[PDB]
Write a structure and sequence with these properties.
It is classed as viral protein receptor. The entry lists the keywords immunoglobulin V domain fold, symmetric dimer, Viral protein receptor. The structure is a homodimer. Chain A has 121 residues and is an all-beta fold. Chain A has a single domain, classed as Sandwich (Immunoglobulin-like). In chain A, 0% of the residues lie in helices and 50% in strands. In chain A, the strands form three sheets. Chain A has a six-stranded mixed beta sheet, with no helix packed on it. In chain A, strands 3-9-8 form a three-stranded antiparallel beta sheet, with no helix packed on it. The radius of gyration of chain A is 14 Å and the shape is globular. Chains A and B meet through β6 of A and β6 of B.
């Protein structure tokens, strides 16, 4: 088991600003496997869902590799292993509106949490 | 090599009778950039409940976690003795009608990710 301590919440920011989407987690004793973190986006302005935007796996970050939000979504912490899977989305666009899901796995534990993002003109 | 991480026949239905063993295939192919650690997860969305995406088995850090997950505990296991060769398949033994649902095979070898869905039908 594994818990994401951030609550599901709605972040509202203005176009062109930076959105911080928190995702902080704690581990249970059996979570001894490799830390794996992913974020997915389900945008409001298209019917595509669960698209990967960022991944931490094998102690490497893959961010711009994923086309959605390329160049604009990055992990905020310099130590993800300390329990901080949060991300920043820079230069917010109206197309960024949607539901973002943080997925944290440290085998065998798994947890997920959704953050809703609204961008204001 | 494939152009991107790929699973053979990514959406299909498997049908078996109650009490039999179902073989749920998930055969994958890597692309040249998939250099991270292999990770494989299967999830169930049962037809008899509102729960979706419940983990039933995981291969991560070269370890298998199966009965650790309560759904189908004791009855779902990987079939291959060499998952790294491309065989992420699982079998479900002594099938029950409550096993009916959508099973998802998720294969990750960073940065590649691929998914497959199997609709499992159990016949009386």
């Amino acid at each position: 088991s594994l818990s994401i301590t951030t609550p599901e919440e709605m972040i509202e920011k203005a176009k062109g600003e930076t959105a911080y989407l928190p995702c902080k987690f704690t581990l249970s004793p059996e979570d001894q496997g490799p830390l794996d973190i992913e974020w997915l986006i389900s945008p409001a302005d298209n019917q595509k869902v669960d698209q990967v935007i960022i991944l931490y796996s094998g102690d490497k970050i893959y961010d711009d590799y994923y086309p959605d939000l390329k160049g604009r979504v990055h992990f905020t912490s310099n130590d993800l292993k300390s329990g901080d899977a949060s991300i920043n989305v820079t230069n917010l666009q109206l197309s960024d509106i949607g539901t973002y899901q943080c997925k944290v796995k440290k085998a065998p534990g798994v947890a997920n949490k959704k953050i809703h993002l609204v961008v204001l003109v």
